[PDB]
Amino acid sequence: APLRVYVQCNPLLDVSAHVSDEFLVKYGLERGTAILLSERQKGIFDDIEKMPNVRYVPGGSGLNVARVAQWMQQAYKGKFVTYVGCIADDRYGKVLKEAAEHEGIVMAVEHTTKAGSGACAVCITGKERTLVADLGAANHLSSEHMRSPAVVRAMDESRIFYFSGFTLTVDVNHVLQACRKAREVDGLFMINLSAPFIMQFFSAQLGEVLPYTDIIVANRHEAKEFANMMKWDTDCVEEIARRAVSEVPYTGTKGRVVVFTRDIESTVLATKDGVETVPVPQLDQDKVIDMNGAGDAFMGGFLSAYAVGKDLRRCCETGHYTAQEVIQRDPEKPSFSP
Ligand SMILES: Nc1ncnc2c1ncn2[C@@H]1O[C@H](COP(=O)(O)OP(=O)(O)OP(=O)(O)OP(=O)(O)OP(=O)(O)OC[C@H]2O[C@@H](n3cnc4c(N)ncnc43)[C@H](O)[C@@H]2O)[C@@H](O)[C@H]1O
Ligand code: NA
């Protein structure tokens, strides 16, 4: 029976379409990056929606992670992951809540009338996806909600706490509440770095949370951006991981773990005990489809194995399995267990 997992992020509906390179130029976008919607992107949602074959699917980084983790523990629907974020009681909000609850996630979400539920433009150019997130309701997640009975109950019963780095743009204090709770319950606190812009523009917030963070998960690019933020003169992912273990402030007792994924190259796994690499199983690249990304899916599999007490390398193997499944989607039960 898996340990209970608490996930917090921004629940967003993904609005996905294939766009031209000129579409990216028009909107001031850098291919393959994620940003928050700004005035520079005025009109982008109307434009993408006016297209053929646009898709509307529940998204949000942490909600993706929660759904992949729950998919790996289907005997524990209602009894495994609780997700916290803020939505409106609108069409998008109802769909995000329904998809997650149908899958067995407990959706301890706030409702606001201050903005409509968030959405993310997912602009697909060949093999790459460029993401523009309009948080809407997600940016209004309140301290009142964080102290509400449903949320405190969920935190009290959970032993693994996962926040996306994307939460750092809302209110760092919400994150710190979970950081302190993880200590209270002798649990684990984990964050993903989410995007280079987190390190570029939310470094103060990230700095507040890192000392309380047991496991830091990122990809190759975010690891290099983290090195840049730290002023570390290295692009060596193994070395960046080594230094994030021992040089980034840490006040916990569970042990600091750093996990940096490298797409087809091996995943870097570091602890006080040393640095290892975990190979990614060979996959025919003609099976990799341009629909889904791999990062949240990796994190979902990682948490599904961590929750049942598997060693760190096995957690990585499980994340590779789930990531490889998700990127091949154009599937009822997993064919791999931690
Ligand atoms: N402000 C915000 N707030 C909240 N949500 C927000 C937000 N902004 C955007 N979002 C949300 O973000 C979601 C999309 O997130 P996500 O699903 O994570 O997609 P992504 O961010 O585009 O991730 P990448 O595909 O680039 O993966 P990665 O670089 O992290 O992993 P890696 O390549 O190392 O690969 C990892 C592993 O996968 C496997 N793998 C990957 N590629 C291959 C390959 N080609 N062949 C074999 N294995 C592979 C390997 O095992 C590897 O270790 C959307 O739903 C959106 O709503
Ligand atoms: Na991601």
Side-chain angles (χ1 to χ4, degrees):
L3 296 174
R4 292 269 299 190
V5 172
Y6 178 99
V7 173
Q8 181 158 150
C9 190
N10 305 316
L12 310 175
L13 192 90
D14 287 347
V15 182
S16 190
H18 290 268
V19 302
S20 62
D21 293 358
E22 195 215 281
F23 177 96
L24 310 179
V25 172
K26 189 191 179 163
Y27 290 103
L29 308 172
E30 207 204 337
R31 185 193 292 256
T33 67
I35 61 163
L36 303 178
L37 177 77
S38 75
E39 184 71 9
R40 180 61 186 84
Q41 295 73 46
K42 183 185 171 160
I44 193 180
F45 279 94
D46 296 343
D47 199 334
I48 311 167
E49 284 163 29
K50 251 81 202 199
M51 309 196 76
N53 309 135
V54 55
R55 294 168 77 257
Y56 297 92
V57 43
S61 176
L63 187 58
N64 290 337
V65 170
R67 291 167 72 198
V68 172
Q70 190 67 58
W71 176 71
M72 287 298 289
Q73 293 294 347
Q74 287 178 41
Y76 299 97
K77 292 186 188 172
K79 304 180 194 161
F80 179 34
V81 177
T82 296
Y83 176 92
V84 172
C86 183
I87 58 172
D89 193 31
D90 59 10
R91 173 68 192 178
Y92 286 9
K94 290 170 189 295
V95 166
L96 292 166
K97 181 163 202 283
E98 183 176 344
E101 287 181 341
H102 177 249
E103 291 163 17
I105 296 156
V106 178
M107 288 292 275
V109 294
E110 186 169 15
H111 296 256
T112 182
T113 64
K114 294 172 175 159
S117 296
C120 186
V122 179
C123 312
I124 303 171
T125 55
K127 332 210 173 178
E128 298 174 72
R129 295 141 25 91
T130 305
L131 319 174
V132 181
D134 176 7
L135 297 196
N139 205 223
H140 295 268
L141 179 63
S142 73
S143 299
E144 290 58 40
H145 186 69
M146 294 303 300
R147 293 189 297 259
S148 70
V151 175
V152 174
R153 170 191 179 177
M155 288 198 177
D156 288 336
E157 71 196 359
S158 299
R159 297 295 182 268
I160 296 159
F161 297 80
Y162 169 72
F163 278 59
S164 72
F166 293 128
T167 62
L168 295 168
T169 83
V170 178
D171 190 341
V172 72
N173 292 321
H174 299 349
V175 191
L176 293 169
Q177 176 182 324
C179 288
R180 291 186 310 270
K181 181 66 64 176
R183 298 283 180 78
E184 180 187 355
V185 305
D186 194 30
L188 273 128
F189 191 86
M190 316 174 48
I191 55 184
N192 174 240
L193 297 188
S194 296
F197 79 78
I198 293 298
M199 278 65 72
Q200 297 158 344
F201 301 109
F202 301 86
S203 66
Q205 292 94 329
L206 180 59
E208 279 202 71
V209 167
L210 288 166
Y212 294 100
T213 299
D214 307 293
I215 305 203
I216 301 166
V217 178
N219 65 9
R220 192 201 280 93
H221 193 151
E222 290 156 11
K224 298 176 175 168
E225 199 68 58
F226 193 91
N228 291 349
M229 182 190 72
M230 290 307 294
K231 304 213 166 175
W232 296 336
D233 193 26
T234 182
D235 72 350
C236 179
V237 179
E238 285 188 34
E239 178 61 17
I240 301 166
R242 188 168 284 118
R243 300 181 189 190
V245 165
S246 63
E247 295 182 24
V248 166
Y250 180 54
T251 56
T253 58
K254 293 289 175 169
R256 161 70 60 66
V257 181
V258 181
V259 180
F260 293 148
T261 60
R262 297 199 294 195
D263 53 274
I264 61 161
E265 292 185 289
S266 68
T267 288
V268 173
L269 175 60
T271 72
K272 69 186 184 188
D273 284 341
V275 180
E276 313 158 47
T277 52
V278 185
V280 166
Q282 191 278 150
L283 183 60
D284 279 309
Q285 293 304 299
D286 291 337
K287 296 178 190 163
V288 177
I289 296 153
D290 59 22
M291 253 230 325
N292 299 303
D296 298 333
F298 173 82
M299 187 75 218
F302 187 98
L303 284 170
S304 77
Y306 195 96
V308 291
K310 302 301 167 183
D311 77 21
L312 288 166
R313 196 165 174 112
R314 186 54 180 174
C315 290
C316 295
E317 294 165 353
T318 306
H320 296 162
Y321 166 75
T322 50
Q324 286 190 342
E325 286 300 315
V326 164
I327 71 180
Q328 291 178 78
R329 276 152 150 154
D330 41 23
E332 181 200 65
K333 279 170 182 191
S335 54
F336 173 115
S337 40

